[PDB]
Structure formats: structure tokens, C-alpha cells
Amino acid sequence: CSPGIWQLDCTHLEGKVILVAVHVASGYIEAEVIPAETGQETAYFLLKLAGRWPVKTVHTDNGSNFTSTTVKTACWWAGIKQEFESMNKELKKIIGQVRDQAEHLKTAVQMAVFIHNKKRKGGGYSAGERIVDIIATDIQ
């Protein structure tokens, strides 16, 4: 599985929208609570993600997510292409587990991302260790 492949989806919780990007080869996650499922939020999230990792292609489970000119302009600019688990259920589990530790869901979501990315898998490395290892190896 290519190191440049990400999957991006939205989930709903507490009337709010959680955008979840998963680095496919590693299981590493970035996520953000957005006010609305909009082309503009998606484009913005893509720019942010691409500035941080070498994002080559993005997949989704809802293709209509990527049809706005706003989104296609963000991929154009960042040089991203499209195509055309669930680690989303596990993230939601974690969120429920830490939910009480924070007032705002947005805070709980970042706690859950932290926990997911740092958890030793294979009982081995964490997803946070695997992404860095995968991308460095691909560089050299």
C-alpha cells in the first residue's frame, strides 16, 4: 500500500461533524470537529493535511464529498489526486471513553486521536511510529 494514500470521511456526534483522515498504510489519524459538512471545510482540511504529510491521493466513502469546485481547487493547488477500517468505530469508542474528561467534543476528539496514534499495536509499534517509519523509508 502506497505511503501517499489517505482516506477522508465525516462522522456525526452530538449534532456536530468530525472529519477523520486515516493514513491507510499505517492507521495514523488526524481529525477535526467542523461546524458543517461544507466544500470549504473539506478544502481547508485538505490544505492543512497536505502541508504536513506528503499527500498524493485521497479516497473517501462518499464521493460526492469531493465534487465542489472549492475542494477540487484545494487538490489542484496541493497537487492531490482522487480515487474513483472502519478505524472510525474504534475512534468513536475512544471518544466515548474520554468524553467526560472535557467540556467540548472537539477536545475529546483530539484526546481520542492522541490515544489512537500512541497505542502500541500488535500484542509492535504505534500508528504514530509507523507513519513516520513508512514515510522516512520512502524518502531515502
The binding site for Mg(2+) comprises: 9, 61, 85
Give me the residue label for grid cell 504536513. 52
**Binding track over 65-104 against a copy of itself, x by CB under 8 A:** ------------xx----------------------x---
Give, in order, the Cα–Cα distances in Å from 45 to each of 32, 42, 74. 8, 5, 9
Q: Is 63 exposed, middle or buried (0-12, 13-18, 19+ CB in 10 A)?
A: exposed
Site for ligand 0L9 in 1-40 (CB under 6 A): 40
Do the Cβ atoms of 62 and 9 come closer than 8 Å?
yes
Number of residues that bind a copy of itself (CB under 8 A): 30
Whether 56 contacts 81, CB under 8 Å: yes
Task: For residue 86, say if its preceding peptide bond is cis, omega within 30 degrees of 0.
Answer: yes
CB of 63 to a copy of itself, least distance (A): 24
Q: Which residues bind a copy of itself (CB under 8 A)?
A: 30, 44, 47-48, 50-54, 77-78, 101, 106-107, 110-111, 113-114, 117-118, 125, 128-129, 132-133, 135-137, 139-140
* List of residues contacting ligand 0L9 (CB under 6 A): 40, 43-44, 69-70, 73-74, 77, 101-104, 107
